[model samples]
Target: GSHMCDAFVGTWKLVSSENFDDYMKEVGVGFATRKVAGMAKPNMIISVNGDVITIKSESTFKNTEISFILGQEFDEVTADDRKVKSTITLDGGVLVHVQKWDGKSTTIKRKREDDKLVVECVMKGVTSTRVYERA
Candidate 1:
């Protein structure tokens, strides 16, 4: 579909995860935070209002949100509380998010696969994957 943002306009529940702790560690997240984050299953809620797209992650441990226009950079405070410059863009049908802070950077790519959403987080060559189903 040409309207790629519409593909993400729904709530998604986490079903599986891989190597998330290492991905967080590479991003400089604290041990306590990583422990809590690793144990929590988050729901991702996405919406679009005109040109702005909002993605919200909700979990028992914490909640985080990011809203931006495609290709436009904005300030973001991550769930782990890292302040960074963030940008999001659509490549094919995938939503690609890049965040940078203190000379460090990370990329998170979200794509639709069959009836699920797959998110891949990469930092310092360590990649973690999380799969979600529509809620």
Candidate 2:
């Protein structure tokens, strides 16, 4: 993990997304779950100090907050979106988040490729990556 890889130190709003709808649809969520997750305007607050990372994913429907160190392992993360446990790594320029929980663990890798930040939301059978432009 690079000490200067605190690229997540900013506020981001979920305005427009790609494959987010498909991601939820493939998650086996019902209409109610779809209604909530699809309509959520997630306000993300991320703070990085040294190796410690504090992430707050907030929306009118649901709110979640998590904090963890860079090298140290973390417990399961149970947010309104999904239950997960993961460790984070800086893969060159990409921030790789490996989640381990329940049946199948996942790796949600993030990086800046070209002019967009790529977020690869991957699970056992599901693999979807979304791109977020700098806001």
Candidate 3:
């Protein structure tokens, strides 16, 4: 949690991959999409000021910014074209995200493991995870 706290205080760049491809691999993104993601330089900025935290995920292909408060419940934090509506929160010493999208709802558990952020996503019929590190 200390590492995550440190990471939250500044902006982090996605220099490499972790468990992310596992999720893509599930949908059969194949080598092409995986290659693109692996080759992409993503920038994630987390603004942790007081009780509110904002995360911005940016890349050459897609860009998204999400904000949340420590103990507050917001509406539809993730209502995207992908048909995902979700909320993010800290769970069991990890960042837990619950998504109701794409005709289903699932939870994603994320924590800092080593030099990367580890994510375990539970989906319908299967589960996958990803870890992202500082660039």
- State the local distance difference test value for candidate 2: 0.66
**Cα lDDT, model 3, residue 27:** 40
Q: Give lDDT per model, in order.
A: 0.91, 0.66, 0.63
Question: Each model's TM-score?
Answer: 0.95, 0.75, 0.67
Rank the models by lDDT, top first: 1, 2, 3
Predicted candidate 1 versus true structure: per-residue lDDT over 57-114, tens digit per residue? 9999988888899999999998898899999999988999999999999999999888
Best by lDDT: 1
True-vs-predicted CA distance for residue 97, candidate 1, Å:
0.4
lDDT of candidate 3 over 70-99, digit per residue (tens):
545555533123445567777666777776
Count backbone overlaps in model 1: 0
Candidate 3 C-alpha RMSD relative to the actual structure: 4.2
Cα lDDT tens digits, model 2, 28-58, are 4567877777777677766776668787778
Instruction: Name the regions of candidate 2 deviating beyond 4 angstroms.
Output: 1-6, 25-31, 81-83, 133-135
Clashing pairs in 2: 77-84, 85-100
**Which scores better on TM-score, 2 or 3?**
2
